[PDB]
Amino acid sequence: IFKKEQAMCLEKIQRANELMGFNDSSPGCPGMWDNITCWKPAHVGEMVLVSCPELFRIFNPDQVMGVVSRNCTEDGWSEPFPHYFDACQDYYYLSVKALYTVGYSTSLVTLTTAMVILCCTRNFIHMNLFVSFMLRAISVFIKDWILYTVECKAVMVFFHYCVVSNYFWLFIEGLYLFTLLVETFFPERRYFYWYTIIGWGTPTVCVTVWATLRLYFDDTGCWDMNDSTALWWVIKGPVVGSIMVNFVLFIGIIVILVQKLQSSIYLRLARSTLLLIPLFGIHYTVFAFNVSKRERLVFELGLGSFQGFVVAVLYCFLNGEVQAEIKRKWR
């Protein structure tokens, strides 16, 4: 990271000394790049001045500044100004990373097992959801193995595609239950041809506008420092929109359900709600606001990274025809 800026300002230095070296005079000390910055060549007694390069942005961000001078001498480059240092927890991150690596791995294992046993039309949407969970876990492992180059940016684009597709797919399952309980007649399975188009065909639009608008306008690093919110919200606006609209559809379904249940009661209502949380993805609604970042990341990567296992327990291994299908291979 240091040799390239070294090469750039040494090209500036040789340009400077070959322009000044055309005349009969010369600087008494030539131009030099010191180990973080550079100085223009000048005579003895002069004071050459420069500000500090962008490394101060992660050293101290509030001086946006520090400026450092240096002097020259017939013996050599003299003593500078108060220099660039003067003038201008890892257990936690490894804890979160270990917690979701065991989480997504137990997710991927029980989901390929539950998708072997599961393979209606509701089961078509559920099998499509399990495809999205397995794609999310595979893409997180590929990102963590590669990041921790044009392959780097392409893997990050594939990563944001799998994650944004998973959040939309939780929302479309919520819209499928709420359309089934309000427009109760009219079975149009033409809807199903539209379901995948708004589930697998909208995140391609989101990450393609993200990739193109990241290629221009500040391509930095491996595209993992988000660094600018207007390029970040092209894949966060859709996910915050999906979470909040799914929260309203969960409120609508619980109103229809308590209205049918009145006709204990409260134990059956709470047992009805508590298995509609992992399917609709309601636990992302607790956090929609940088602040409380440690508690947010623990709750949504430590105990949200088992959502694939909880869904594959609640909706394939325990409920309904699969047990009958298990008995179809048991007796």
């Binding site: 990271i1 240091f2 180990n35 973080i36 490394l55 992660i58 050293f59 220099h83 240092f85 927890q89 890892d90 991150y93 979160v96 990373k97 997180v140 990102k143 990041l147 921790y148 990563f159 944001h160 994650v163 959040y167 690093g221 491996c222 993992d224 420092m225 988000n226 970040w232 894949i235 966060k236 996910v239 992302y284 970042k293 947010r296 990341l297 949504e300 990567l301 949200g304």
Partner: peptide, 28 residues
Amino acid sequence: HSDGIFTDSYSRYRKQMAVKKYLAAVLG
């Protein structure tokens, strides 16, 4: 989004660690 906030914070931290170690090895 929860994996995006983690990857942002972790890669920003790891760059900060390498830059601090480099400005420790050069400037002492």
